Design a protein around this ligand. Structure first.
Ligand SMILES: [Cl-]
Ligand SMILES: [Cl-]
Ligand SMILES: [Cl-]
Ligand SMILES: [Cl-]
Ligand SMILES: [Cl-]
Ligand code: NA
Ligand SMILES: [Rh+3]
Ligand SMILES: [Rh+3]
Ligand SMILES: [Rh+3]
Ligand SMILES: [Rh+3]
Ligand SMILES: [Rh+3]
Ligand SMILES: [Rh+3]
Length: 129
């Protein structure tokens, strides 16, 4: 599913991401934009052989099992395919664990490079939230 910007903002809010670990909703929407272009089916292979899955491009190296990432962990206790669902529950729940890991949203390199420090509120402008 390719979400609309405000549609995704609303789903993220309902699932408790607005101000989660201090990160306003626009931070999450901006991260999703640059990670996946709001596409829940997005996948991308990393150089180390791991793969990033879903709207927030969660990595199989640590967070989910895809059966093909040697030596990796599955800290969200989910198949990586769960992260590709039209329903964002699994991605949100796992994102909450990631952002709590010590590094905050710096865990998402696209957030650090493209969202951090910018006017992220723009990403939720106009939405009925
Ligand atoms: Cl957009
Ligand atoms: Cl915001
Ligand atoms: Cl594996
Ligand atoms: Cl599994
Ligand atoms: Cl933080
Ligand atoms: Na894994
Ligand atoms: Rh808010
Ligand atoms: Rh708020
Ligand atoms: Rh890499
Ligand atoms: Rh649901
Ligand atoms: Rh839902
Ligand atoms: Rh502004």
């Amino acid at each position: 599913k390719v979400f609309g910007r405000c549609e995704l903002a609303a789903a993220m809010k309902r699932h408790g991401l607005d101000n989660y670990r201090g990160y306003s909703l626009g931070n999450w929407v901006c991260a999703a934009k640059f990670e996946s272009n709001f596409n829940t089916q997005a996948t991308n292979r990393n150089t180390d052989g791991s793969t990033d899955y879903g709207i927030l491009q969660i990595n199989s190296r640590w967070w989910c099992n895809d059966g093909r990432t040697p030596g990796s962990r599955n800290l969200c206790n989910i198949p990586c395919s769960a992260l590709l669902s039209s329903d964002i529950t699994a991605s949100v729940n796992c994102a909450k664990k990631i952002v709590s890991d010590g590094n905050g949203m710096n865990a998402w390199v696209a957030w650090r490079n493209r969202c951090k420090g910018t006017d992220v509120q723009a990403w939720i402008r106009g939405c009925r939230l």
